[PDB]
Amino acid sequence: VWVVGMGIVMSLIVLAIVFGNVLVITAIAKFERLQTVTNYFITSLACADLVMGLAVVPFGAAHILMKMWTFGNFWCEFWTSIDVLCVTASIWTLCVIAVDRYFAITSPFKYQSLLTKNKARVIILMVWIVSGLTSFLPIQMHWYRATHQEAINCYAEETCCDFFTNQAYAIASSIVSFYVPLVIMVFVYSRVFQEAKRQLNIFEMLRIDEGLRLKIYKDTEGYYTIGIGHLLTKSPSLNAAKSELDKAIGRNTNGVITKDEAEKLFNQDVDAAVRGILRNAKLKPVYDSLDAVRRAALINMVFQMGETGVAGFTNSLRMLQQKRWDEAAVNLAKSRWYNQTPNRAKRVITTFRTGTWDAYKFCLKEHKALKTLGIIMGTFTLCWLPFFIVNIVHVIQDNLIRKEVYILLNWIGYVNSGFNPLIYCRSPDFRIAFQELLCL
Ligand SMILES: CC(C)CCC[C@@H](C)[C@H]1CC[C@H]2[C@@H]3CC=C4C[C@@H](O)CC[C@]4(C)[C@H]3CC[C@]12C
Ligand SMILES: C=CCc1ccccc1OC[C@@H](O)CNC(C)C
């Protein structure tokens, strides 16, 4: 009766992997906005999962339920070679993603890959050619084969497909195929998360706090705004707001502006906020006493409220100058501004308290993209590392291997081929593609 329940659960795992990855591949294959360098590697990853879901996981399920191998010794060696290829290719692709994200964040381009689609295609094809060679040749040439009697009996028997390996292979294949790219991926992507946080500036901080709209909108007070929190007029007239817009840009806008035009106004307003601080006798000394991070928090306040407005916080500024952060924070919380925009205020106040970008952590869309890619990496590790740790331990220790524990932990890694599509539901671009392909 256990076999029935086990059979259903296993069928749904197969179905969840297949449609899940087919959906992801179809989304990148058809939607123009999703044909990026990062998404080409995501396709390489989704292919390995689809291959795992169609050629590995179904035959694995059959081996458990029938308690025997009914496909012969040739498909057994081939099946094992494909499985290892899928794991090796999946982790090497995740390592490439990490290295590519590093080179991007360390470049002036910041979020765009330095690789071209042609180069990325070659990188992907080289990963599969190398992973194919490292995974098929030691299995086909029988370099993996153990010398103990129980293994030889399993090799000769056409109804035995128990992955018996010699200690050397179980160490060599594990290091080259998994541990080496994992160590590099974890070490490199921790630096990408570091650079994203360290390279956070006032412009990024304000694009988070104010947002971006190329259409005229009303703020909390009700004043007409455009771009990144650029107030057009205090007048309650759309024509009055459109006139000030046409005058500022220097063309017939009709209430709509370009991304290039939005950045133009933004660089002007930020520049005006910094200029205003230096001409203000009450803000200029506070600006000098502050560090790089806390200067942005003061520029942020002058951007939102204005030179005169911020200069009104005589008590708060005094303690910012005296470097008494926690004390300044209470007086900043005890204000009209904190009540008006509490989410934005809390962030700026935390910046003044901590002196770090911790409040603006993964708030930018480009930063959320790094988090999404970081989740994909982290899950793969949590799913495969227990199998690989218990694998390398039962090589040195020799005992406590079991079949029950080995297959179970291998299936923890198998279930991962169905998780990646669910994690892509974080990206709005993928979400928009999925609902279109599913007609919702
Ligand atoms: C089991 C073995 C024999 C089959 C392996 C499947 C191979 C053919 C698949 C898996 C991953 C695939 C790649 C995934 C990513 C891309 C990006 C896309 O923009 C062009 C094609 C390209 C470069 C694919 C080519 C074919 C590919 C290398
Ligand atoms: C020899 C250790 C296992 C191994 C090493 C390197 C790369 C992949 C590896 O194995 C992944 C497993 O999914 C294999 N599963 C068997 C075929 C049931």
Author numbering: 31 to 230, 1002 to 1161, 263 to 342
Paper text:
G protein-coupled receptors (GPCRs) are ubiquitous cellular gatekeepers in eukaryotic organisms. They mediate sensory stimuli and cell signaling, regulating all major physiological processes, and therefore have historically been primary targets in the pharmaceutical industry. Here, we present a simple and efficient method, dubbed Complex-LCP (Crystallization of membrane proteins using transient ligand exchange in LCP), for structure determination of a target GPCR in complex with a panel of different ligands by taking advantage of the SFX method. Concurrent ligand exchange and crystallization is then initiated by overlaying a protein-laden LCP bolus with precipitant solution containing a large excess of the ligand of interest.
Two of these ligands (alprenolol and timolol) were selected to play the role of a transient ligand owing to their favorable kinetic properties. In the case of timolol no supplementation of ligand to the crystallization screen was necessary, whereas in the case of alprenolol the screens were supplemented with 100 µM ligand to maintain crystal growth. Two additional control plates were also set up: Control Plate A without any ligand in the precipitant solutions (negative control) and Control Plate B with the same transient ligand as that used during purification added to the precipitant solutions (positive control). The XFEL β2AR structures in complex with carazolol, timolol, alprenolol and ICI-118,551 obtained in this work are almost identical to those previously determined using synchrotron data collected from cryocooled crystals, validating our approach. Crystal quality also appears to depend on the identity of the transient ligand used for the exchange: the resolution of the structures based on alprenolol as a transient ligand is consistently lower compared with those based on timolol.
